[PDB]
Amino acid sequence: TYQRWQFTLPMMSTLYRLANQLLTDLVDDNYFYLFDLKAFFTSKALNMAIPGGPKFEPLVRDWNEFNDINKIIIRQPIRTEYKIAFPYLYNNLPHHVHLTWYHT
Amino acid sequence: IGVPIKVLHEAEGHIVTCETNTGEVYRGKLIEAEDNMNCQMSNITVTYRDGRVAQLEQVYIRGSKIRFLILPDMLKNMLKS
């Protein structure tokens, strides 16, 4: 029926060596820091685009003191990456947002 | 190593009663119990064969010369055996 296989470890090392042209050279996960699925989900929900990443259609589609510009200390700008990383801190209204894996 | 011995070591730190081969009765805290039943205890009350009591700070009784020990009832309530 050819349904299950079990191999010995020299077999697996030979196959692993022969397949290396198609395989990645990453050992851990941190390469995909803001490039994982959860970052892309959050990005889609906030209508923001990571620079390499996909772009979608938006999900969501007055004079005030809280938003005033005389009170702001513009030290660094807030990038879009920061809003993906700490979504509840840098967004008013985060709906359907996913928290990303912090670090391994 | 015997099943009763493991249960004895379990009573270390508890108040226990010990009768010797000569019938003197020692009640107090079990500090150390060895494999051969050698027993170190503290703050003892001893009740002799005549009925009289005394008080001792520190004692050590040889296992062979122990007739028996009473352990806390709560501690007993081993199951696998």
């Binding site: 079990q6 470890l9 198609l22 | -």
Partner: protein, 111 residues
């Protein structure tokens, strides 16, 4: 026992390998269900590539993200087998043929 053998460096090497290499045993998979390039577009596009290729990477990631969002687990339904029903009839016979031979028949019969 020795401290290490010939297999030791390789056996340690397989602990940090990507799937399915990291395992000893498994179920055989369908040939089509193994993309083999999914990891290439899940990484950053290399530097210096032209605009069409850079955009290409974004589109492949887009479809990857939409499949992952929209997924709901499979509904447990009464399966039916079409070919087993055909083979139960006396009208369908069965044989073993070369793939090219069968392919030619498919072409002729469709015509």
């Amino acid at each position: 026992t020795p401290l290490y053998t010939d297999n030791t460096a390789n056996g340690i090497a397989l602990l940090w390998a990507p799937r399915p290499f990291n395992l000893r045993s498994g179920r055989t998979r369908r040939a089509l269900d193994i993309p083999l390039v999914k990891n290439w577009y899940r990484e950053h596009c290399p530097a210096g590539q032209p605009v069409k290729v850079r955009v290409s990477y974004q589109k492949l990631l887009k479809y990857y993200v939409l499949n992952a969002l929209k997924h709901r687990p499979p509904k447990a339904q009464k399966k039916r087998y079409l070919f087993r029903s055909f083979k139960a009839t006396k009208f369908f016979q069965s044989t073993k043929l070369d793939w090219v031979e069968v392919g030619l028949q498919v072409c002729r019969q469709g015509y």
